[model samples]
Target chain A: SLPKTHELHIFGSFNGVKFDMVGEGTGNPNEGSEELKLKSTNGPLKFSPYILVPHLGXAFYQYLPFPDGMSPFQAAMHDGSGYQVHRTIQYEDGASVTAHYRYTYEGSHIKGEFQVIGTGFPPDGPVMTNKLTAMDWHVTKMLYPNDKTILSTADISYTTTAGKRYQSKMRENNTFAKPMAADILQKQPMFVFRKSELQHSKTELTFKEWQKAFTDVM
Target chain B: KEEDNMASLPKTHELHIFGSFNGVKFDMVGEGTGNPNEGSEELKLKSTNGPLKFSPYILVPHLGXAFYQYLPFPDGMSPFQAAMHDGSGYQVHRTIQYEDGASVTAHYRYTYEGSHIKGEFQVIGTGFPPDGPVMTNKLTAMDWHVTKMLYPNDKTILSTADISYTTTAGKRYQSKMRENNTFAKPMAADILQKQPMFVFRKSELQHSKTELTFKEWQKAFTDVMSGG
Candidate 1:
């Protein structure tokens, strides 16, 4: 199945474009220009667009810390270290790709499963793997004075969102590869993109379900 | 921990003191066993395989187990235990500078095995100014097991990597949530499409059945569920 629509935004403190790659602290005291600049990346894209609507900017952290096997054009998130968020897209031809946003500094290792969801061009699919969408964004810090929590009851350090160690939630088990993702995914929107049988050159018919996920999830 | 007026004092300030009086004190109290009412068996320790309650300095010296419980002393035994004098264990540590220009230091660590907890702690005192012809050296080390974690739920937390130390204002600290790190195990499409693809899984404790979501399936499975 393909994605009726998809939205993926992941920028952890370590993956940030700056010093530690982690976000630059909380709200920039000045909200005027800060609101729009809060994220690390976001945009619409495609591979030249003449043939396809757009299948670009869907992946980020594409090739960072480049030149290493320790690095995964593929990477798995680890827990007891940080938070992780991931999204995927499956084309009608059985080809797919994904983007993962890891919150903590524990990049590419030591989580439940070490394999992330991804795939390159198969050469014969209607979906062109060449068109890539890479983007980054910052994770907001938990607001203070109100409550020192982001996810109601998690096991972790006495700090708020944007920490570097494994915290505990009131929930019995803390064995998730990504932080706050389980809860969010549990309530994720039911957006599905089914492959079409009547082929009008599979490439041109990809838009029908592209924007439908936003409405369903929101 | 605010590092004290520390930056202004020394880059890394270290000392030992019996009690920390610089607004770095908080007591963890829980009803003991055989006290009656709310202090009944429910409030008592469940040392069958675990002990609750603790002080970072003393409670976790032995991976969450205490040390002072079994050791025999010659001059006197434990710092908290009493012989004829009611001594409230001063397993407390703080770096304090005195008017006479003297200083002291303390350090401790905690560990956990299942629900069992223990720790090791030590304290040392010394004078900045030499005493006559002999310099007095004082140091003591002890340990203790948790009786029960009082307000185990109140333990603090810091969720992300961007937050500053100021966020943890009080002299308080707590562990973070346990995780499997399975969140990003799926492909972007399954991740984006919400299609069921098993890419990975984290450790779960429940003995019952759990619903495997598309993300879960994408993380480790071969394909999406017909319904996923």
Candidate 2:
């Protein structure tokens, strides 16, 4: 019989957009599918929209420079290659796992940054002081003005600790496309997670103390 | 004085509308020449038989403001005249009686505001029995919003919403709702019916225009239905 899969549930915000995601994955690394329900707050009431990423595990794993035998979390912490060279530590209780990668794809300059705090790891996953979890990932793809200066950016940050949740923001500006209307832009800012502070637990000194200690480091 | 008012309108305005609603497809071409109030206009809905046939049973400028005389515009000017002056928004109601004692009442509203054009077209049928032919409930309603620059050139579609239709047996066909670029495929009607949004693309509209024969149009419509 096949090994039993573990259920994963994550609730958070991305770029101020509140989202709840659920999935199931085997113990094997990067083997899960996540369905995300995003709630847009642009109007007076909440509008719920869903984005189903059937192969989320494959999507996330494709970006990581993982070896054949090692998981992405393991590879990111141990690998000292050029792509995963920028590693830094903040403290014993919590540390920042950072990786910077740059590449050129289809004549576009692409840059990606992955940063995560160890203490923000989800409770459902394997526990480790340096486990790769609750990440702040940013990627930007740009084509210079000679080519119409198209720019695409995505910033996603999430903390599954006592109170902090996932948050993400994304924007794409293509010179070839017309600019979005002002009325539409006015509503774009409404997808913010208003009550982030309430999500954290004050009693958990690790998440709270890490915030106070490494506020500048991150 | 009326001639002077008419001169304010555009000499000719052309629009090509292509989309699928409630499993039925619409590929229509419209031209409003001279004054819209009394202009010589031609609107043809693409029939399955041949090259864009003009159906006397169906109305031209059905989705647009060509029939603006019925609408009350500001300053005693026609809807197109008011639109040329300071932009205009209004609704018009009309009823068409067929030779078979069947009739359809159409209520539509067109708005030219700022740099965008928006409108809603709805039709209600009467005199058809509960188990009549499919034509009894074709293209009951649709609403669309598009920028002027894109609308005339057929480069893009801003959005379309609330499209609905019904079958001959009085069953409402599933409509692909919301504004997006994904087209609904024929085989995926069950799947599309559950989805609240559908998408359309410029290429689909481009393909729709090139199909002159009914066979070619059917092929194009198939690609559109398959979301090609």
Candidate 3:
């Protein structure tokens, strides 16, 4: 049987500051069915989903690896639109992260925001503070027949806890190894990743790396 | 100009093409800085002298295939818009000239149906002097379906060919041909056999050459399409 797969775009506010996150994974979302369950997360705000597809199974989140020490969050809003979503996670110590996203049906464009803020977060004590260091939004569009990626542009910016700021932009036209069905192509998900420095601020995967990761999952 | 109403196309870095026309082998390469908005681009061609010898350099501005000049969608509709809506038929009529004074006039038709984009391209070429030589080439991509949101795995074919040439001394040579190999097979095992015409990135040529078998070529083609 083919593995269950999902692509998602997430956004929300972090103490009134906007951010975004993107996630994609393939697996049997069920418990004990560990053939190849993998999930990758990216965004300016560093966070992972607790469970990507809950209906698939309960053991879904257990086997998949997530970032170290960071608490996993789940989508709080999925309204069958496929392109719009919301997610939030709040710790007992008052630290929390939230995001929401919406895609334009007419123009096939996407817009979203996210937030990650708190004081006295997990593992550390009440003296520790969690703040967003860097964030980005990467959007890509594909053209048919040739499998050409006609659009790949990103807006990325970074801020240090010490108040330093950095920003950069990138765009490229790339081709992929496979053609996407129109149905899936229309639902192509965007990616956002958390970065610390200016050099690392870009899309989560390069064209070559993205292709390899996709093929591996298949 | 159509540029004012053009779709927002992606920027291209390189293009690699290799094929045969009426038994004469030809290859082409294009390089650029990955910015479509820029005007600096280069194209080179290599061909075996035949009834009609193609120029060594291709006029970059007239190369429709390289510049999205052949992708003429309907007015007020982007490629995505055309693909999403029903009953969109687009056609391209273009003439591409080479440094040798030879020219190829292309008549291409594309239609969107049932989520697939079907296309037929017919090309007619004339050598330097009006009476020197004439050539015809045709291609058809029947089921151009998408995969993985970027690449396509389809059966695109060089359906027909006809070439005729006459020398200044009155000697005439002619050949009519048809091919069955899909674009997936860039080269055939028998060098003299009719091979399929195809285009790919220059970076992929090394990998394709190392894997020479038809099956291997198909796999390599798949990998290339995957942008691997």
Candidate 4:
């Protein structure tokens, strides 16, 4: 293909909350070469839209360092690093997410700390205009009390929520780590502006399939 | 089979360690071996060594096999001998204070147990940073809070973790880690679309039957097939 402009929508989430972003652009210009560029668009594009939705953000390293010859945007996540993600959904029911994550050495075990918040959708809707529809939060801390692993003395705090705001925090140390296979990809959303096509107009489209990917892999 | 490789080889041999830790190239001459399970390896480099001439104290993770191991070490007979060694591990360089008044010398001891490595280093010096020095940046050096596990077989990474630290209140927080399959890929995609770093990857790992035959094929077709 001659690098036809394509529409792309990447669907993702923070915990259970969902969000989507659309863009337009071209694939790698050369065959299997490191050439790719995508620009977000406000107008309708001239190409069909492709959608992607993923279960989690294993491929995204919120605070991990990029190895040599790599940047955060274009990095291959491995078993060693951890992941973090923040999400926002606009237009309808605007919302926000603060998700914390930790992964073991082999991608086997995980710990999470999350805080999800949102405002009511429409002005005349229920929750009385602009108040948080949900608020979920939880946090805890413990003093090792002599650097000992014994469960002798401990100090920890916790708080939780039910709907809309789904937040919780976990505290653990010197725990066992298991090994497992890791499979995560980085998919960039793009809006397609075509040269000329009948049904190919720029438009936001949800992925019909379960998901799509744009690894930006080497 | 074991003796074929182990025979003729002395218990401890004079050698050199050189590699691109992260990205910078460095070479240090001392006495050591590829085997660390029995714990007999030693390296001694002065401030006037290769790249260490400019910065005496610095340490980092060896990104990959960029490290060339086991060159002849001609610095007289190896000082220390008859020590156990490890088959797997990594290296580091300097400290926070680089000025004349404050300098440091570090001694690293590692034991590679095949499945894992036991590594520890003690730095004795003056003018060390308050709060025991803190590393805020990721590039150039590993963050102070970040702990790492490296595969000595190829200098690849096995894991890195951020253990808990003491708070001003003298309390320790148990900051447990977790695995989240990126719950915000689309949101991040939008931001990446808004501002994507422009860089070129001249080459990439090959993914064919032939590429796999080579011993250096780190990323083969199987990685792509596994949906990674």
- Give one digit per residue, the lDDT tens place, for model 4 in B113-200: 4323333444444443333322211112211122212121122212222223333344332222211111111221212221111111
Shift in Å, residue B105, candidate 3: 0.3
Chain A: TM-score in each candidate? 0.23, 0.20, 0.25, 0.24
- Better candidate by lDDT, 1 or 4: 4
DockQ category of candidate 1: incorrect
Scanning candidate 4 chain B in windows of ten residues, the lowest lDDT window is B213-222
lDDT of 4 at A73: 20
Computed on alpha carbons, the lDDT of every model, listed in order, comes to 0.21, 0.27, 0.28, 0.24
Could you arrange the candidates by TM-score from highest to lowest? 2, 4, 3, 1
Candidate 3 displacement at residue B138 in angstroms: 23
Alpha-carbon RMSD, candidate 3: 22.9
Candidate ranking (DockQ, best to worst)? 4, 1, 2, 3
- lDDT (Cα, tens digit) per residue for candidate 2, span B82-149: 54444333334445444335555555555454433334455554554333332432433221211010
lDDT (C-alpha) at residue B24 in model 3: 51
Model 4 quality (TM-score) = 0.22
For model 1, state the Cα shift of residue A91 in Å: 38
Question: Best candidate per DockQ, number?
Answer: 4
lDDT of 2 at A167: 35
Residue range A74-180, candidate 3, lDDT tens digits: 11112212222233434334554333333322222222222223222443322133233433211211222233232223322333354432233233232332342
lDDT of 3 by residue, B1-228 (tens): 345333233333333444333345544443332223222223333222322233221211123233332222222322322222323322344554433466555554544344233333445555544343333211111111111111112322222222222223433232222222222232212221212211111111111211110000001012212222
Worst 10 residues of 1 chain B by lDDT: B210-219
